[PDB]
Every structure is written in C-alpha cells, then in structure tokens.
Enzyme design. Structure first.
Site, PDB file in Angstrom:
ATOM      1  N   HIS A   3      88.343 -33.635  39.420  1.00  0.00           N
ATOM      2  CA  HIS A   3      89.105 -34.289  40.768  1.00  0.00           C
ATOM      3  C   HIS A   3      90.578 -34.172  41.126  1.00  0.00           C
ATOM      4  O   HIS A   3      90.891 -33.772  42.234  1.00  0.00           O
ATOM      5  CB  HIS A   3      88.838 -35.905  40.425  1.00  0.00           C
ATOM      6  CG  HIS A   3      89.233 -36.872  41.659  1.00  0.00           C
ATOM      7  ND1 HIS A   3      88.505 -37.209  42.435  1.00  0.00           N
ATOM      8  CD2 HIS A   3      90.099 -37.481  41.697  1.00  0.00           C
ATOM      9  CE1 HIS A   3      88.912 -37.951  43.390  1.00  0.00           C
ATOM     10  NE2 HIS A   3      90.077 -38.264  43.095  1.00  0.00           N
ATOM     11  N   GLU A   4      91.481 -34.546  40.070  1.00  0.00           N
ATOM     12  CA  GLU A   4      92.985 -34.181  40.056  1.00  0.00           C
ATOM     13  C   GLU A   4      92.954 -32.636  40.587  1.00  0.00           C
ATOM     14  O   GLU A   4      94.035 -32.540  41.436  1.00  0.00           O
ATOM     15  CB  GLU A   4      93.559 -34.536  38.885  1.00  0.00           C
ATOM     16  CG  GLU A   4      93.323 -35.928  38.651  1.00  0.00           C
ATOM     17  CD  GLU A   4      93.620 -37.017  39.931  1.00  0.00           C
ATOM     18  OE1 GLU A   4      94.603 -36.735  40.800  1.00  0.00           O
ATOM     19  OE2 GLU A   4      92.748 -37.761  39.904  1.00  0.00           O
ATOM     20  N   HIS A  23      93.110 -32.209  44.081  1.00  0.00           N
ATOM     21  CA  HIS A  23      94.354 -32.740  44.974  1.00  0.00           C
ATOM     22  C   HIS A  23      95.368 -31.648  44.849  1.00  0.00           C
ATOM     23  O   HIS A  23      96.096 -31.346  45.561  1.00  0.00           O
ATOM     24  CB  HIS A  23      94.796 -34.257  44.151  1.00  0.00           C
ATOM     25  CG  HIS A  23      93.930 -35.296  44.535  1.00  0.00           C
ATOM     26  ND1 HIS A  23      93.919 -35.800  45.883  1.00  0.00           N
ATOM     27  CD2 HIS A  23      93.389 -36.076  43.651  1.00  0.00           C
ATOM     28  CE1 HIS A  23      93.234 -36.821  45.764  1.00  0.00           C
ATOM     29  NE2 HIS A  23      92.905 -36.875  44.639  1.00  0.00           N
TER      30      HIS A  23
END
Ligand SMILES: [Mg+2]
Ligand SMILES: [Mg+2]
Lengths: 497, 497
Positions: free
Chosen positions: B267-268, B271
């Site tokens: 997920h990170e 980003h």
C-alpha cells in the site's frame, strides 16, 4: 524566576523561531549522515542552504537586534538574562561582520576548495589544491579584518572558534608543552616502556560483536537510550543535540582494531552527557548548550582518555570483551591496557596517541599563525609542514596525503580552529585532578561502574552552566583557576613513568 | 524551457524557502515516528510549531502574494508556469481564509480534543469526548463559512481535502455503490464463496521473518532502497517525501496475521512510487508531488488490492513465504489467496475487507454531512452511527470503541476527509481496466515480477503530472473520463463471482 525581565522575554519568544530552525538543521545533518538515501543529497543540500539564509536573516532582523541592544542597556538583569544578551550580542556581532557578498565568496570558494582538496588527497597531488589554499588564506585574512582584533589578526580567527581565545593564550600553552611534554615523550619512546604497536590492532571482528560491547558500555555509563538518546552508525563519529531531552551520537565499525569504535563511542558520550546534563530551565534559549569547542573537547577527552584508557575501565570491560570477541581468548587485561595506551609518533593526527597528538596541533598552529600574519606562500607550506613534522616527531611525510593534505579543515576555511583540540586534551587533565580531590576514590568507582557521582560532579562544575559565562570566566568560577598545560604533563608523567 | 517567465522565476526563488521549511517538516515528522527518543517530544513539538507559523507567514508575505496575483494576470504562460499559479493561488487563498484567532482556537481545541478522545476510546466513554465533539462541529461549520461554498457548507470542507470535490460528487458515487455494490456483498456473503476468516490469521511470526519477505517484495517492485528510498518501522505505516530523490515508507510488524505487514508495505509502496516518479524539472516547485488525497489513494490501493490481493501476486510471493515462514508448510497458494481476500462485515474500518470497506466511509459521510448541515447533536451521534452500521453491515457496535470512537479524524478536526478514501478505492478499479487495455498481459507480468511497464504506464498517465492540473482535470486528460464507481463494482463482481 529565571527569566523575569520583559525585554528578555520578548527576545526569548522571537528566539524560539531561530531555535526551531536550528533544531531542524541538526535533524537534517544527522539524518544526512545516518539515514538519507544517497541521491537525496541535492534536495537535502538546498534545504539546508535556504534555512541557513533564513536563520541569519532572522538573527539580524531590526526588531531582534533592537531588542538585544535595548536589553544590553538594562542593569536590573540577573546572570541568566545577562547570559542571554552576552551570547546573542556575540552572534549578532559575528553575523554582521561579514558583508553578504563576502559570505557568498566564502561559500563558493569553500565548496569548490573542498571538492578540489578531496581529489587532491586521493591522488596525492598538492597542485590541485594549492591555488585553492591561496584563495582561502586571503579569505582568512580578510575575515580577521572584518572581525577586528587588538594584537594579531590570528586572534580574530581564534576568537571565532573559541570565545575569548587569543594568540597569546595559544602561544603560552604550547610553550609549556614544548619544554615539558616534549622531553617526556622522548624518554617514554626510548625506554621501551609502552609499545609502539600491538597485535590486537590486527584482530578482525564482525560488526555485531562490537556493537554488543559498545551498547554494554553505554548502559554502564547510564546513557539514556530510547528515552533521551540514540547511538547509530555514520562515516565519522559525532554528537548532535536536537534538544536537552534528545541527544544523539554515532560511531563506526572499521571491522578491525576494536579500540577505535570503543574509545570513539566513549569520546562522543562525553560530548553528549554535557548536552544531556543541561539545565532545562534554559530550554529554547541561547544559554542552553555547551559553551565552546574547547570546553566540549574537555568532556569528550575526559571520558575517552582520563577514563577510557585507564586500567580500571579496562578491567571493567575486560569480561565483556571476552564474551563477545573470540580472539580475546589469547589476551590478558594488561594486553588490553598496553593496547589502549600505545605511544607512537606517526603521520596522521586522527590516529595520534595522546602523548604525540598535541604536537600535530602545535604545527598546524604555527603554520596558521604564519599564513594569516606574514605573506606566506601556499606552494611553500608543504615543506614547512614537513620540516615541522620532522622537528617534533622525527618522521617526515613521504606523500601529500600523509602530510599537509590529511585534514579537511583548511579547505573548509576553518583556520584558527585546530587549537581548540589541544585545549580539550589539556583541560581534561586539569579537570581530572580537581575531581580527584572531591572524589579520591575516583579509580575505584570507575572499576565498579559507579559513574553517577562523576557525572554529577561534571554537571555542577561544567554542564548546568551552559553558555551563561564565556569559556574563561566559566573555568575560573568552577575550577578556581584558568587553563594550565602543566596538568596534562603530570597526567602523562604519572601514567607512563 | 519549463520555467521561462520572469515573474514565475521570482516566485520559484521565494518558494524555495517555503519548500525548504517543508522539507524540514517532513524530516521532523518522519524522525518523530521512527527514531526520536520518547522524551524528545516536547522540543520536537515546539520546533514543529514555530516552523508552521514561519511557513504560513512566508506564504502570506505581501511580496509573495503580490507576485502570484501579478502572474495570475499574465496570458503568455505555459501549462507548467500556470500550474504554479493555480496551486499557489489555492494555498494563499486557503491560508488567508482563517483569521489568526480562529487558527488559534482550532489548534487549542483540536489538541485538547485529541487527548480527550484518546482516553475516551481506551475507557470506552463517549461522555469524555462528547463536549469536544460539539466544539469541533461548531469549528467545522465556521470553517465552511470562512472558506465559502456554492451549494452546501459541506462542499467547503470536502474541497479542503480534495481540490474540486463537491458534496454532489460524493452523493453520486455512494448512490451507485448502495444500489450496485451492496447487493453484490449480500450475494457474496450468502454463497459461502470466500470465507469470513482464515487460520493463517492466527499464525505467529518473528519480526525478522517478515522483514525478509517485505524486503524481497520491495526489491521485486524495484523500490530504490539506499539510493532514493528507505523502509523502516513505525506505530502506523505511512509514506513521506523529503524530495523526488528521497521518499520513505514504514510498516509495522504486529507479530501475527502476516497479511497486514505485507499489504501495508505494498500500500505504502504505491504512495511512494507516485512521489518517486515525479518530474525532476519541477524539483523545488509547487507542481511537483501528488495532486491530492484521492489520487494518492488510487495509487496505494492500486498496488495493494488490484495487485497485492491478486492470485498472481500470491503465486509470485508464495515461495518466499515458504522459505521464511515455518507454519507455511501447512498451507497452499490457494490458502494464501483466500486469506488475502477474506470478506467479513466487521466493526473496524481499518480492518474492513475491500468489499465492506467503502460502507464504513459512506456512514461517516452521512454523519458528517448532517453535522455541518442541520443542527446535529453530539449526544445523538452514537445511535445514528450504530443504526447506520446496522443498516449497512447488519452488525451493531456494543461499545463506543468499536463504533463512533474508533478513528482519530474528528478529534483532529478532519471533517470532510473520509470520502477521499473511497475515491482511491474506486479509482484503483477504474485505472485497472484502463491499463488492462494497454497491457492485456497485466496478470502475466505480475506473476513474473515484470513491473516496469506497469510502473511506466502509471508515470505517463498519473505521476509525471504532479500538481499541474486539479484532480478532476487530471483524470479527464489521462483517462478520457471522470471517476465512475461502476468500475469498482465490476472489479468486485469479476473477482468474487
Ligand atoms: Mg569530539
Ligand atoms: Mg494510504
């Protein structure tokens, strides 16, 4: 209580901003050395630069300067509020001594000189740095004139790095050393007493082994890990203060010669305890924090050499060395002692034992005084450096990297900086005898890991005072006297004879 | 080239300072979470505060504002220079909407409300937060009036967190979900297709085991460790951008339920890649960097759910899981698949599977619109929250911590923020089908760890554009359309049916 005056409070409120940028600068520099992915350097650099200009701008804002001048004109103020003014007056003064164009010239020249010095050292070629050295000599002289000075121009550079330090001061300590410490060295070197090398220097180790030893030593010292401090790795050991409740040190693990990482960690611990044992009533103010490079080095050297190379510290850590280092099953605690105290004149200042170290500084001192005083020639420095290395330590550099090119200081423009190192070594000796008086069982406490009384003695005498008093006034108040090279000589005599 | 206009250059030069303080703020926050000794919090906090005020001061300086206004009055400017103005105009606008007294009130109230919410959640007592919630509701409404809005006051809060987002926008996506996604959920839940739990959730692991797995996955993704990025641990996973060449993410190791640390890291990563794949010609300027919370979550969710929960990603990592996890010798790759895709309505939003997740946001959306629109009563929120949880997921919180008290957002005053999460989930689906068109062998490339073409597709379509265009205009330009919840529904249908 501590800060009562209204003018003083208005100042401290504005200072907070300046203080915050500094907090930020420390975090930036520390992170750059310890965590930053390599390519993040360009953006880190511009960020560091914008803040330095912002900081300087805030320190010299009319409002801030007006307030300091005003308070300076108040007679009602206690020592603390007064300390605020003395410190801030010196900063505003130093900051406005340099014309913005000059600050520019220096940044430019310095940056390019460091890069040129960097390849010059690696390829052993002084010609690639020479012209840059002439440019830096000219900048140093100009700087001395911008700063101002009574006796010599070199007093201005010295005062830049050690508040109140004068050429006469430095001239003196080195005289006492050249006539009293020099012979002691010769005698030590000729009796075969302590060795010039030790097999333990070649013993290799795996990182984790020594990090277990360093960790154990720091806990024995009461270093507040995870609560107010950290220990990490970086190319070169240093200490930073993000705050009174956040002080960090780093060390490095060469992979061999375990004495290095150990004493280096202890050395930095000495710097840290100092910042750690600051008075919290001064938090966010210009009086909190170590007063100068010299007093700071008196703390790092106190822990490193006074304690770290003592027989007692060796006995205390000996068992830990045996537990974590396999090759230790072939050495005794005396072997570790002799190892920690080897004495050998050699080319590199950063490797110099404690007896030969200060001679590396004296020569840098002589060359520096000449460079800024008379019309010295860069092309002529190498030989002067070589002849001096030969006159004090009997050895002569064979290549530029072993000599005049070994340190970054001149390329950075740090002229008048080197002497603060000797001051620290000297002061560490003097402090030892003064504490040896209030705590005659000093040695016994070290061997048993009872450092609290020693940490507290340092706090009351040096630490809690932060930057309230100038370096000299600080010593008189706490030690009833001024620096005196004589102590370092006895310490050495009493240790090697 | 990119920045030609003189007025634009004068702006970028001043912006550098503002940019530098931000670089510093990121480093401060990151370090606070990852390295800072616990007691360093007070000094870190004041430093963070002084800089925020300094930053705001610089953004609203007459000189800076005058320049932006002036440039805004230029018609010669390219898209890039124009992007600079649009972005800066929105910031100066938002920044001067709040009276300095109001900014103060909010900081005060917020700080105290967070602390009160913090104990209230732990001791399951809404009364300790209730009054604080009424104060925050009043601040939100005031804020809406200070910001300005055409239709509803809630449009102003929404626009605060997602440039150009309107209540009507949010009202729409959730309608399509409530009539098309809701039934799909019911059907999924009743066929016993995917399980509501898995034994792998209980399997414990030692930190080092999973850090070996996470590390391996990040290298498979081409995450530039040690060069432009870092992976560390912190209480809650996040991503920071110190610069285009310095982006950092963190994860956490709960010690059990290994799916968490894995998908969280992925997920990170989503980003980060975004910030990592920014256009370096925009370095130090306001157009560099992700345009909004919603577009950012479209990237994190793209990698986490579109790829991370896909059968192919499971096959790719399966061998690595077996090598490092002992308890894996009892499960098959299908077992890992079902585990990664469990579906189960439950109380906690942060734990919600991908099918039930968006319903947690819809309810927060309904309560928020009411709180700022009608005269809603804090004491009445708990039941409304409970009835909604029951109407959408069939379950009813039994204690405040499982319900209205679970998230920090309201206590922080982040009202109008929650909807950006749904936007990201939705957008991740839409993007999947658009890439599935240019790269029909999408799945095959994932299973083989060939992510470069997928990373490059994201760059050209989303990343390189930074903040040149507003969120909506960015989508049209790159995807030939606007957000449409319909894609998320098909994705889910095609995945669970
Ligand atoms: Mg030192
Ligand atoms: Mg996210």
């Amino acid at each position: 209580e501590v800060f009562q005056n209204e003018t003083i409070k208005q100042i401290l409120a504005k200072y907070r901003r300046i203080w915050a940028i500094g907090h930020a600068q420390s975090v930036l520099g520390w992170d750059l050395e310890v965590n930053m992915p390599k390519e993040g350097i360009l953006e880190r650099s511009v960020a560091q630069g914008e803040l330095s200009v912002l900081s300087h701008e805030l320190l010299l804002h009319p409002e801030f300067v007006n307030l300091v001048e005003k308070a300076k004109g108040l007679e009602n103020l206690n020592e603390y509020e007064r300390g605020i003014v003395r410190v801030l007056d010196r900063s505003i003064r130093i900051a406005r001594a340099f014309p913005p164009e000059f600050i520019r010239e220096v940044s430019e020249t310095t940056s390019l000189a460091t890069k040129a010095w960097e390849e010059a050292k690696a390829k052993d070629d002084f010609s690639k740095f020479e012209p840059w050295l002439d440019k830096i000599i000219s900048l140093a002289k100009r700087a001395a004139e911008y700063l101002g000075y009574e006796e010599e121009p070199y007093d201005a550079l010295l005062d830049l790095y050690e508040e109140g330090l004068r050429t006469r001061d430095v001239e003196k300590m080195f005289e006492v050393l050249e006539k009293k410490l020099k012979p002691l060295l010769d005698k030590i070197l000729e009796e075969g007493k302590v060795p010039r090398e030790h097999p333990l220097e070649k013993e290799k180790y795996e990182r984790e082994w020594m990090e277990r030893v360093n960790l154990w030593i720091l806990q024995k010292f009461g270093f507040p890990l995870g609560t107010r401090a950290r220990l990490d790795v970086s190319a070169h050991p240093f200490t930073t203060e993000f705050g009174i409740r956040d002080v960090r040190i780093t060390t490095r693990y060469e992979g061999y010669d375990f004495r290095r990482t150990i004493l280096s960690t202890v050395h930095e611990f000495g710097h840290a305890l100092y910042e750690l044992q600051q008075d919290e009533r001064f938090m966010f103010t210009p009086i909190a924090g170590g007063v100068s490079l010299g007093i700071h080095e008196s703390q790092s050297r106190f822990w490193e050499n006074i304690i770290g190379r003592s027989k007692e510290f060796v006995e205390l850590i000996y068992p830990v060395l045996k537990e974590n280092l396999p090759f230790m099953s072939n050495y005794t605690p005396e072997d570790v002692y002799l190892y920690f105290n080897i004495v050998r004149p050699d080319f590199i200042r950063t490797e110099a034992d404690v007896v030969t170290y200060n001679f590396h500084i004296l020569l840098r001192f002589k060359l520096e005084r000449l460079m800024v005083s008379e019309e010295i020639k860069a092309k002529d420095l190498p030989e002067m450096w070589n002849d001096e290395m030969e006159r004090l330590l009997g050895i002569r550099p064979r290549k530029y990297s072993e000599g005049i090119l070994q340190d970054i200081h001149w390329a950075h423009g740090s002229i008048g900086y080197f002497p603060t190192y000797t001051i620290g070594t000297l002061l560490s000796a003097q402090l030892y005898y003064h504490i040896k008086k209030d705590i005659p069982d000093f040695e016994e406490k070290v061997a048993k890991a009872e450092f609290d009384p020693i940490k507290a003695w340092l706090r009351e005498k040096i630490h809690r005072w932060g930057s309230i008093y100038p370096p000299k006034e600080l010593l008189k108040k706490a030690i009833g006297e001024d620096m005196d090279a004589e102590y370092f000589v006895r310490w050495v005599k009493e240790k090697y004879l």
